[PDB]
Design an enzyme around this catalytic site. Structure first.
Site, mmCIF file in Angstrom:
data_model
loop_
_atom_site.group_PDB
_atom_site.id
_atom_site.type_symbol
_atom_site.label_atom_id
_atom_site.label_comp_id
_atom_site.label_asym_id
_atom_site.label_seq_id
_atom_site.Cartn_x
_atom_site.Cartn_y
_atom_site.Cartn_z
ATOM 1 N N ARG A 264 50.173 99.801 17.705
ATOM 2 C CA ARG A 264 50.143 101.145 17.145
ATOM 3 C C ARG A 264 49.634 102.155 18.124
ATOM 4 N NH1 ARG A 264 48.110 100.116 10.810
ATOM 5 N NH2 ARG A 264 49.256 98.146 10.558
ATOM 6 N N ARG B 138 39.448 99.744 16.135
ATOM 7 C CA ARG B 138 40.722 100.436 16.355
ATOM 8 C C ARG B 138 41.261 100.076 17.742
ATOM 9 N N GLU C 37 37.175 98.938 6.143
ATOM 10 C CA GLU C 37 38.520 98.426 5.858
ATOM 11 C C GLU C 37 38.905 97.229 6.767
ATOM 12 O OE1 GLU C 37 43.192 100.001 5.767
ATOM 13 O OE2 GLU C 37 41.580 101.368 6.363
#
Ligand SMILES: N[C@@H](CO)C(=O)NS(=O)(=O)OC[C@H]1O[C@@H](n2ccc(=O)[nH]c2=O)[C@H](O)[C@@H]1O
Ligand SMILES: N[C@@H](CO)C(=O)NS(=O)(=O)OC[C@H]1O[C@@H](n2ccc(=O)[nH]c2=O)[C@H](O)[C@@H]1O
Ligand code: NA
Ligand code: NA
Lengths: 421, 377
Positions: free
Chosen positions: B218, B230, B302
């Protein structure tokens, strides 16, 4: 990269060794660039001596009450030409550097001299190719039966040279990679690594894929960012762990193993032998230059141990001078028996790169005798290409009804499955 | 894509349901392209334009979805486990992993720049152990069929699941000369869900349950500068279901339970959030997020997103099944859920299992994969 001092001083002897690989070193351009550098260097030394003398003569002319304008004008012109001489010398060195990045590695003297694959020699073979009691089916026919090996759905998603595996065939492929990593970490002294699968250009220049083999890679073009490339092999990410370092000799050998997908767009139509994406368990060694040829024998034996434990008949080939990869000084290829093709097919390449990749990435170690930084040697070998091992398992272990017998060493990873389909 | 008949017969009710997501349906541009084409036929360019609009419309949230504008209106539905109270100063995964070079962001930056990671030795082994445990669990206990898929796909597969045309900027594209471009998958949802595109399944084939362990790529500018929370590349064990439409909301509860079981077995405290209308992903009708306890952050973060997409992706893919009652090929329903994002599970494991001296206790279920290692460092 070869030793630049060696290329510059002995172009003829370097050209003779490269000629055994069928590579024609441009000795005429090297000698012309050297002649240009020498010509400019002699001019700059003559200029430097002239300018320094005129600058000191200004002080003396002042002491005499003389006109310093002719001396100031000489100094100004000489200085300006010296700055040009420097730009010239840097542009010559820049052109030589770009040329030296396109030269293949020097083959070791123990590599048989040959112009093509027909001069490659069999070193040894292990195991006996099975004589089947029925008509053998290829991996495509075996895998397609229950949709567990699916090239059509893969083509729907991604176009040609991709594969989809499902159920027990996906599990067998995973079992193979796990078996390989577990073996190398537990018995062969390799440290496991998870690496990025996208790298920038300097890593690829470090291992030799760049600048010359850009067209064989998938590139991700980015707006005002460095471009990224998908790794063609974990060799790129693993070998570059030590780039720009001066290692302590006590850290050698550094042995790495990684299980990664491998991506190639290189310019076997039916099946998964040649793919744009394939898994490979890669072994990499960063070693003391004195031990690298012995390290290659051990590296090749680590790859062989996978085929022996899987009871897959194979052959070991010593590649000749005319059939080697760009960065290799010596290579052993392993080829596994493929029943449907009635021949051995390549499943691994184990190479000693010598100091060629280390020179490009400035991967050094501190020599205990001299106390000076010296280039390490690097090696890499497939242990093994996972999709090709899957092809070998499916075909060698096939039964009369089209079912596949699970290799003994893979049964602990197959959740009780002993026969597929 | 939404049911074109609903967009036609109920434009105001569809626009009102989409407004809860903060999306404004251009009812005028649809009403104009419908009134224009009705005149153009009475007397193909208008179709190509309407199709582009139809492809830019997010999914209708289910009636049970809490109405809210942002993440602050998300509803905590339940929790599991008690976040540990430590008798020393808690370290983050970066400080824990960097200690012996087993988690190395610096070498990864040297190779590939920012948002990449290098793992070595026992930390690399722990990450691999996590993904193996997850795929072994879903295949043996949760009814999923394992799949190895391509990690490069062409544009139609991404349009099938909804990342295309609207979210091209978030993907890594490989530009190819005189060939269709390839994209790195952002999730195995893309490759797995598209297995059934352009097909009419037998009702007996349903539910089709797939599980894959893949890297995910991503390039998102919209969203943790320190660490591996991330990343441009991360591993994720993805669960996908192709189901009978009458069962899809019950299938969501079972899918969320499959993701939760991974955290329960690893003894990682977590919470479950029902996402509100304004925080939902483009292709979802209903989503539950799993958030794992992160001791250095003193909050849940998350680790999984489980969604029911209804007939939205099925419509884009033309994925049908032969309804046993009517004999007619009808759209299937699709679901997807992380079971789990592997890198974030490694973060949760390093921090929740850390000891006073900086060493890491190996979770019980991972000990069989760790070759005798029970304490890291
Ligand atoms: N880093 C070194 C050693 O692994 C290297 O990559 N050498 S190699 O020969 O290019 O690649 C290593 C191995 O990868 C396999 N392969 C290749 C292309 C393909 O489409 N599918 C495959 O499975 C071949 O068997 C080959 O021996
Ligand atoms: N296919 C569906 C279900 O997995 C999907 O991809 N949803 S998701 O939320 O976009 O992604 C699934 C999960 O991936 C993780 N993640 C995300 C970004 C990142 O940089 N690193 C991560 O580990 C997040 O925990 C997230 O819940
Ligand atoms: Na080769
Ligand atoms: Na999410």
């Amino acid at each position: 990269m070869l030793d630049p001092k060696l290329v510059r001083t002995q172009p003829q002897e370097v050209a003779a060794r490269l000629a055994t690989r069928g590579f024609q070193l441009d000795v005429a351009r090297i000698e012309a660039l050297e002649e240009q550098r020498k010509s400019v260097q002699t001019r700059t030394e003559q200029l430097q001596a002239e300018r320094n003398a005129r600058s000191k003569a200004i002080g003396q002319a002042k002491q005499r009450g003389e006109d310093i304008a002719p001396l100031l004008a000489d100094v100004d012109r000489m200085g300006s030409e010296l700055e040009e001489g420097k730009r010239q010398l840097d542009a010559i060195q820049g052109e030589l550097d770009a040329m030296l990045l396109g030269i293949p590695n020097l083959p070791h003297e123990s590599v048989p001299v040959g112009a093509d694959e027909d001069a490659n020699v069999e070193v040894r073979r292990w195991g006996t190719p099975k004589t089947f009691d029925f008509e053998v089916k290829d991996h495509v026919a075996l895998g397609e039966r229950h949709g567990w090996l699916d090239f059509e759905t893969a083509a729907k998603l991604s176009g040609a040279r991709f594969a989809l595996m499902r159920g027990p065939i996906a599990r067998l492929h995973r079992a193979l990679a796990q078996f390989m990593i577990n073996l190398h970490t537990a018995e062969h002294g390799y440290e496991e690594a998870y690496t990025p699968y996208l790298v920038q250009a300097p890593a690829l220049q470090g291992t030799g894929q760049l600048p010359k083999f850009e067209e064989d890679l998938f590139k991700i073009g980015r707006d005002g960012e460095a471009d990224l490339y998908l790794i063609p092999t974990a060799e790129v990410s693993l070998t570059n762990i030590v780039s720009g370092q001066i290692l302590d000799a006590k850290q050698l050998p550094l042995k790495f193993v990684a299980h990664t997908p491998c991506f190639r767009s290189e310019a076997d139509t039916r099946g998964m032998i040649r793919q744009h994406q394939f898994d490979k368990v890669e072994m990499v060694q960063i070693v003391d230059p004195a031990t690298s040829y012995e390290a290659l024998e051990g590296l090749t034996a680590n790859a062989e141990r996978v085929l022996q434990l899987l009871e897959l008949p194979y052959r070991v080939l010593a590649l000749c001078t005319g059939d080697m990869g760009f960065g290799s000084t010596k290579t052993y290829d392993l080829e596994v028996w493929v029943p449907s093709q009635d021949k051995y097919r390549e499943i691994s390449s184990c190479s000693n790169c010598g100091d060629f990749q280390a020179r490009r990435m400035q991967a050094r170690y501190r020599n205990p005798e001299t106390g000076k930084p010296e280039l390490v040697h690097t090696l890499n070998g497939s242990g093994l290409a996972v999709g090709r091992t899957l092809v070998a398992v499916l075909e060698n272990y096939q039964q009369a009804d089209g079912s596949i017998r699970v290799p003994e060493v893979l049964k602990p990873y197959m959740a009780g499955i002993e026969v597929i389909g």
